[PDB]
Amino acid sequence: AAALSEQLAELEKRSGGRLGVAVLDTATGRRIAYRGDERFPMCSTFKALLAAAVLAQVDQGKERLDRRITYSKADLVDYSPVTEKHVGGGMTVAELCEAAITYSDNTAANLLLEALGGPAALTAFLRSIGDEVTRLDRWEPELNEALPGDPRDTTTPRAMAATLRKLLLGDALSPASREQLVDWLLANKTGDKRLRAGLPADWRVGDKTGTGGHGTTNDIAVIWPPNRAPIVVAVYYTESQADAEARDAVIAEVGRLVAEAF
């Protein structure tokens, strides 16, 4: 037999690449990590944090979810499945948050960054809620480059699990904004082959995925088993030589290992 952290090490060994995991069981405070303090490229997982920062502006009376943002075809960057349909007519701030979170729409994220004040404003938001580790440096789509050894646009699994707990289950947002943020992650459409695929069917998942260069596949989540306190799980996987479906399977296996331990 072996501890969960040892099981994750064996998963890493047979999969190749570099795997980072942090888990927090909020019932007990049980915490476990594997490469929990190493930096990993966030890729789209930052969009959960971006939406939170926007909601904090709403909480402060500095932004409105129903504000309509009009843009142009010149704004469209790689991978924008929702915003590329709304150059005509635009989209509201809420719709952009939903697109960014549930479809990993890259232009939506840039438009929300523009509304917020950019990557330094998002990073400042994170410092203000006690995350001294996570950093957004670039805009879409360059922030997905995921160069090994590059500290730009990175987090650690422990920092991200702590931040996601703070945002979805903590004091950072108003009750209404916290509910809205949870709502968006519960509605995610990009995660069915990742953590969700390894968890029992009646566990409820709110998650945000990330995908990038140098074989990067990520998934961060708050998970509610039936009639039980939530578990926060952050998974970062990079420097893999495996194809996208195989990397999804690595994350799904982390989910299964977590479900078999907890």
Query: Within 13 Å and on the Cβ side, how many CA atoms surround 101?
Result: 25
Cβ-contact 90, 67 below 8 angstroms: no
Question: Which of 5, 15, 44, 177 is the catalytic position?
Answer: 44
Nearest distance from C-beta of residue 11 to Na ion, angstroms: 19
The CB-of-244 to Na ion minimum distance in angstroms stands at 4
Q: What's the CA dihedral at 25, 156, 114, 142 to 10 degrees?
A: -130
Among all residues, whose Cβ is closest to Na ion?
Answer: 244
By beta-carbon proximity to Na ion, the closer residue of 158 and 194 is 158
Decide: helix, strand or coil at residue 20.
strand
Task: Report how far residue 30's alpha carbon sits from residue 24's, in angstroms, rounded to the nearest whole number.
Answer: 6
DSSP state of 25: E
Closer Cβ to Na ion, 97 or 235, answer by number: 235
Alpha carbon dihedral 19, 22, 25, 26, in 10-degree steps, equals -150
Minimum separation from the CB atom of position 240 to Na ion (A): 12
* Nearer residue to Na ion within complex by CB, 22 or 185: 22
What are the residues binding Na ion (CB under 5 A)? 31, 158, 243-245
Minimum CB distance to Na ion, residue 234 (Å): 11
20 near 146, Cβ under 8 Å?
A: no
The distance of closest approach from Cβ of residue 248 to Na ion in the complex, given in angstroms and rounded to an integer, is 8
How far apart are the C-alpha atoms of 254 and 218, rounded to whole Å?
Answer: 11
Backbone angles phi, psi at 205, to 5 degrees: -120, 130
Q: Are 37 and 156 in contact (CB under 8 A)?
A: yes
Q: Which is nearer to Na ion, 30 or 127 (CB)?
A: 30
The amino acid occupying position 168 is L
Q: Determine whether 44 is an active site residue.
A: yes
Closest to 41 (Cα-Cα) out of 24, 23, 22, 18: 18
Q: Shortest CA distance to 209 belongs to which of 111, 136, 100? A: 100
Q: What is the amino acid identity at position 190?
A: T
In the bound state with Na ion, the residue whose beta carbon lies nearer, of 31 and 214, is 31
Residue 107 beta carbon to Na ion: minimum distance, rounded to whole angstroms: 24
Annotated active-site positions, please? 44
